Amino acid sequence: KLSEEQQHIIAILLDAHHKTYDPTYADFRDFRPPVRMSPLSMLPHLADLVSYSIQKVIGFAKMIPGFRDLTSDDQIVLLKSSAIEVIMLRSNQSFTMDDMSWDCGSQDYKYDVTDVSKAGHTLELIEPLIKFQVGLKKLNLHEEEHVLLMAICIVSPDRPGVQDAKLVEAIQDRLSNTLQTYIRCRHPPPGSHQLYAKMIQKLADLRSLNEEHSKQYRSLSFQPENSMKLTPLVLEVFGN
Ligand SMILES: C=C1/C(=C\C=C2/CCC[C@]3(C)[C@@H]([C@H](C)[C@H](CCO)CCCC)CC[C@@H]23)C[C@@H](O)C[C@@H]1O
Asked: Atom 30 of ligand 1 has which residue's CA nearest to it?
Protein backbone atom coordinates (compact mmCIF):
# COMPACT_ATOMS: atom_id res chain seq x y z
CA LYS A 1 0.00 0.00 0.00
CA LEU A 2 3.11 2.19 -0.04
CA SER A 3 3.46 4.59 -2.96
CA GLU A 4 6.76 5.25 -4.72
CA GLU A 5 7.04 8.69 -3.15
CA GLN A 6 6.89 7.11 0.30
CA GLN A 7 9.29 4.38 -0.80
CA HIS A 8 11.39 7.34 -1.91
CA ILE A 9 11.13 9.06 1.48
CA ILE A 10 12.32 5.85 3.13
CA ALA A 11 15.28 5.51 0.77
CA ILE A 12 16.23 9.15 1.34
CA LEU A 13 16.17 9.24 5.13
CA LEU A 14 17.91 5.89 5.49
CA ASP A 15 20.78 6.99 3.26
CA ALA A 16 20.70 10.44 4.86
CA HIS A 17 21.15 8.76 8.23
CA HIS A 18 23.92 6.43 7.08
CA LYS A 19 25.76 9.53 5.88
CA THR A 20 25.30 11.22 9.26
CA TYR A 21 25.75 8.25 11.60
CA ASP A 22 28.93 6.20 12.00
CA PRO A 23 28.42 2.74 13.58
CA THR A 24 32.18 2.50 14.15
CA TYR A 25 32.25 5.82 16.00
CA ALA A 26 35.79 6.33 14.69
CA ASP A 27 35.44 10.11 14.93
CA PHE A 28 35.11 9.81 18.71
CA ARG A 29 38.91 9.70 18.75
CA ASP A 30 39.11 13.34 17.68
CA PHE A 31 37.23 14.57 20.75
CA ARG A 32 39.02 15.90 23.82
CA PRO A 33 40.08 12.89 25.95
CA PRO A 34 37.48 11.75 28.54
CA VAL A 35 38.44 11.72 32.22
CA ARG A 36 36.86 9.41 34.80
CA MET A 37 38.34 9.74 38.29
CA SER A 38 36.34 14.60 39.41
CA PRO A 39 34.15 17.73 39.12
CA LEU A 40 32.77 17.82 35.58
CA SER A 41 35.76 15.77 34.43
CA MET A 42 33.59 14.61 31.52
CA LEU A 43 32.15 17.93 30.34
CA PRO A 44 35.07 18.48 27.93
CA HIS A 45 34.67 15.12 26.18
CA LEU A 46 30.88 14.92 26.07
CA ALA A 47 30.61 18.57 25.07
CA ASP A 48 32.47 17.55 21.91
CA LEU A 49 30.29 14.48 21.36
CA VAL A 50 27.20 16.69 21.49
CA SER A 51 28.64 19.37 19.20
CA TYR A 52 29.76 16.61 16.83
CA SER A 53 26.23 15.21 16.89
CA ILE A 54 24.67 18.62 16.31
CA GLN A 55 26.65 18.87 13.07
CA LYS A 56 25.44 15.42 12.02
CA VAL A 57 21.83 16.26 12.88
CA ILE A 58 22.08 19.32 10.63
CA GLY A 59 23.35 17.23 7.73
CA PHE A 60 20.54 14.75 8.26
CA ALA A 61 18.04 17.60 8.45
CA LYS A 62 19.17 19.03 5.12
CA MET A 63 18.44 15.72 3.40
CA ILE A 64 14.91 15.68 4.83
CA PRO A 65 12.58 15.59 1.79
CA GLY A 66 11.08 19.05 1.53
CA PHE A 67 13.15 20.52 4.35
CA ARG A 68 15.07 22.60 1.80
CA ASP A 69 11.84 24.33 0.75
CA LEU A 70 11.62 25.91 4.20
CA THR A 71 12.76 29.50 4.71
CA SER A 72 16.28 29.87 6.08
CA ASP A 73 14.84 31.27 9.31
CA ASP A 74 12.48 28.38 10.04
CA GLN A 75 15.31 25.93 9.40
CA ILE A 76 17.22 27.81 12.09
CA VAL A 77 14.26 27.53 14.45
CA LEU A 78 13.49 23.84 14.00
CA LEU A 79 17.04 22.54 14.41
CA LYS A 80 17.76 24.89 17.30
CA SER A 81 14.86 23.29 19.15
CA SER A 82 15.05 19.73 17.82
CA ALA A 83 18.83 19.32 18.00
CA ILE A 84 18.77 18.02 21.57
CA GLU A 85 15.72 15.80 21.05
CA VAL A 86 17.24 14.37 17.88
CA ILE A 87 20.46 13.66 19.76
CA MET A 88 18.60 11.79 22.50
CA LEU A 89 16.85 9.87 19.73
CA ARG A 90 19.87 8.96 17.61
CA SER A 91 21.65 8.05 20.84
CA ASN A 92 19.22 5.20 21.46
CA GLN A 93 20.89 3.42 18.56
CA SER A 94 23.99 2.95 20.72
CA PHE A 95 22.08 2.55 23.99
CA THR A 96 22.04 -0.90 25.58
CA MET A 97 19.73 -2.38 28.21
CA ASP A 98 22.39 -4.86 29.34
CA ASP A 99 23.87 -2.27 31.70
CA MET A 100 21.89 0.86 30.84
CA SER A 101 24.74 2.65 29.08
CA TRP A 102 25.57 4.07 25.65
CA ASP A 103 28.05 1.65 24.09
CA CYS A 104 30.04 3.02 21.16
CA GLY A 105 32.60 0.27 20.66
CA SER A 106 35.50 0.30 23.10
CA GLN A 107 34.83 0.66 26.82
CA ASP A 108 36.73 3.94 26.49
CA TYR A 109 33.80 5.45 24.60
CA LYS A 110 31.15 3.71 26.70
CA TYR A 111 29.03 6.18 28.65
CA ASP A 112 26.91 5.42 31.72
CA VAL A 113 24.94 7.24 34.41
CA THR A 114 28.01 8.37 36.34
CA ASP A 115 29.56 9.84 33.20
CA VAL A 116 26.49 11.95 32.45
CA SER A 117 26.30 12.96 36.11
CA LYS A 118 30.00 13.78 35.95
CA ALA A 119 29.27 16.15 33.06
CA GLY A 120 27.30 18.59 35.20
CA HIS A 121 23.82 17.08 35.09
CA THR A 122 21.91 15.82 38.13
CA LEU A 123 19.90 12.60 38.24
CA GLU A 124 16.73 14.67 37.97
CA LEU A 125 17.21 14.83 34.21
CA ILE A 126 19.32 11.70 33.78
CA GLU A 127 16.63 9.47 35.28
CA PRO A 128 13.86 10.46 32.84
CA LEU A 129 16.44 10.32 30.05
CA ILE A 130 17.44 6.72 30.72
CA LYS A 131 13.78 5.79 31.16
CA PHE A 132 13.14 7.31 27.74
CA GLN A 133 16.10 5.35 26.37
CA VAL A 134 14.67 2.08 27.66
CA GLY A 135 11.11 2.70 26.50
CA LEU A 136 12.30 3.71 23.04
CA LYS A 137 14.48 0.61 22.92
CA LYS A 138 11.57 -1.62 23.92
CA LEU A 139 9.72 -0.50 20.79
CA ASN A 140 12.38 -2.23 18.69
CA LEU A 141 11.61 0.19 15.86
CA HIS A 142 12.84 -0.69 12.39
CA GLU A 143 15.57 1.53 10.96
CA GLU A 144 12.98 2.88 8.53
CA GLU A 145 10.79 3.77 11.50
CA HIS A 146 13.72 5.16 13.47
CA VAL A 147 14.76 7.54 10.69
CA LEU A 148 11.22 8.82 10.15
CA LEU A 149 10.64 9.65 13.82
CA MET A 150 13.82 11.75 13.84
CA ALA A 151 12.68 13.71 10.78
CA ILE A 152 9.15 14.22 12.10
CA CYS A 153 10.82 15.48 15.28
CA ILE A 154 12.72 18.05 13.21
CA VAL A 155 9.88 19.55 11.18
CA SER A 156 7.35 20.32 13.91
CA PRO A 157 4.97 23.27 13.33
CA ASP A 158 4.50 24.04 17.02
CA ARG A 159 8.18 24.84 17.57
CA PRO A 160 8.40 28.32 19.14
CA GLY A 161 9.43 30.85 16.52
CA VAL A 162 8.01 29.07 13.48
CA GLN A 163 6.37 31.37 10.93
CA ASP A 164 5.53 29.07 8.03
CA ALA A 165 4.00 26.45 10.33
CA LYS A 166 1.56 25.35 7.63
CA LEU A 167 4.35 24.39 5.23
CA VAL A 168 6.31 22.89 8.12
CA GLU A 169 3.13 20.96 8.89
CA ALA A 170 2.57 19.86 5.30
CA ILE A 171 6.01 18.25 5.40
CA GLN A 172 5.56 16.58 8.79
CA ASP A 173 2.20 15.20 7.68
CA ARG A 174 3.77 13.72 4.56
CA LEU A 175 6.45 12.08 6.70
CA SER A 176 4.02 11.08 9.44
CA ASN A 177 1.52 9.55 7.02
CA THR A 178 4.52 7.67 5.64
CA LEU A 179 5.31 6.22 9.06
CA GLN A 180 1.70 5.20 9.66
CA THR A 181 1.49 3.36 6.34
CA TYR A 182 4.85 1.66 6.87
CA ILE A 183 3.87 0.22 10.25
CA ARG A 184 0.76 -1.28 8.65
CA CYS A 185 2.47 -2.95 5.69
CA ARG A 186 6.06 -3.49 6.79
CA HIS A 187 5.79 -3.95 10.56
CA PRO A 188 3.97 -7.21 11.48
CA PRO A 189 2.22 -7.89 14.83
CA PRO A 190 2.43 -7.98 17.74
CA GLY A 191 5.18 -5.38 17.48
CA SER A 192 2.96 -3.24 15.26
CA HIS A 193 0.31 -2.80 17.95
CA GLN A 194 -0.22 0.91 18.60
CA LEU A 195 3.37 1.28 17.40
CA TYR A 196 2.62 4.71 15.92
CA ALA A 197 0.83 6.07 18.98
CA LYS A 198 3.81 4.94 21.06
CA MET A 199 6.29 6.70 18.78
CA ILE A 200 4.36 9.96 18.90
CA GLN A 201 4.26 9.65 22.69
CA LYS A 202 8.05 9.60 22.67
CA LEU A 203 8.07 12.97 20.92
CA ALA A 204 5.96 14.21 23.84
CA ASP A 205 8.61 12.90 26.23
CA LEU A 206 11.33 14.69 24.28
CA ARG A 207 9.46 17.98 24.65
CA SER A 208 9.73 17.31 28.38
CA LEU A 209 13.39 16.26 28.33
CA ASN A 210 14.15 19.32 26.19
CA GLU A 211 12.31 21.64 28.58
CA GLU A 212 14.26 20.39 31.59
CA HIS A 213 17.43 20.50 29.50
CA SER A 214 17.40 24.07 28.19
CA LYS A 215 16.60 24.90 31.81
CA GLN A 216 19.32 22.85 33.50
CA TYR A 217 21.64 24.18 30.79
CA ARG A 218 21.12 27.86 31.62
CA SER A 219 22.34 27.03 35.13
CA LEU A 220 25.24 25.06 33.67
CA SER A 221 26.11 28.05 31.49
CA PHE A 222 25.73 30.73 34.16
CA GLN A 223 29.32 30.01 35.15
CA PRO A 224 31.59 31.35 32.37
CA GLU A 225 34.05 28.66 33.47
CA ASN A 226 31.68 25.89 32.36
CA SER A 227 30.52 27.69 29.21
CA MET A 228 34.27 27.92 28.59
CA LYS A 229 34.53 24.14 28.24
CA LEU A 230 31.83 23.96 25.57
CA THR A 231 32.24 24.45 21.82
CA PRO A 232 31.22 27.52 19.76
CA LEU A 233 28.53 25.39 18.12
CA VAL A 234 27.00 24.17 21.38
CA LEU A 235 26.87 27.77 22.62
CA GLU A 236 25.42 29.19 19.40
CA VAL A 237 22.76 26.48 19.15
CA PHE A 238 21.67 26.10 22.78
CA GLY A 239 21.43 29.85 23.29
CA ASN A 240 24.00 32.32 24.63
C1 LIG B 1 25.73 11.71 21.10
C2 LIG B 1 25.48 10.36 20.78
C3 LIG B 1 25.74 9.24 21.64
C4 LIG B 1 25.34 9.13 23.01
C5 LIG B 1 24.61 10.10 23.76
C6 LIG B 1 24.80 10.42 25.12
C7 LIG B 1 25.89 9.71 25.98
C8 LIG B 1 26.72 10.68 26.86
C9 LIG B 1 25.86 11.82 27.50
C10 LIG B 1 24.94 12.59 26.48
C11 LIG B 1 25.84 13.47 25.51
C12 LIG B 1 23.77 13.43 27.12
C13 LIG B 1 23.99 14.88 27.74
C14 LIG B 1 24.85 14.87 29.03
C15 LIG B 1 22.56 15.55 27.89
C16 LIG B 1 22.58 16.96 27.21
C17 LIG B 1 23.54 18.09 27.64
O18 LIG B 1 23.58 19.17 26.70
C19 LIG B 1 22.01 15.61 29.35
C20 LIG B 1 20.57 16.12 29.47
C21 LIG B 1 19.55 14.99 29.24
C22 LIG B 1 18.30 15.51 28.53
C23 LIG B 1 22.71 13.48 25.95
C24 LIG B 1 23.00 12.32 25.01
C25 LIG B 1 23.97 11.54 25.87
C26 LIG B 1 26.53 8.07 20.96
C27 LIG B 1 25.95 7.67 19.57
O28 LIG B 1 24.69 7.01 19.76
C29 LIG B 1 25.76 8.92 18.66
C30 LIG B 1 24.90 10.04 19.36
O31 LIG B 1 24.91 11.20 18.53
From this structure: 91
Method: X-ray
Cβ atoms of 145 and 179 closer than 8 Å? yes
Architecture in CATH of 1-240: Orthogonal Bundle (1.10)
Phi, psi torsion values for 111, nearest 5 degrees: -110, 130
The vertex-70 CA angle with 64 and 65, nearest 5°, equals 20
Give the H/E segment covering residue 83.
helix 72-91
| Ligand 1 geometric centre to CA of 186 (Å) | 30
Contact in structure between 196 and 179 (CB atoms under 8 Å):
yes
Selection from 10, 8, 29 nearest residue 143 by Cα: 10
219 CA from centroid of ligand 1 (Å):
18
Q: Which residues contact 224 (CB under 8 A, 6 or more apart)?
A: none
Q: Where are the domains of the chain?
A: 1-240
Resolution in A: 3.0
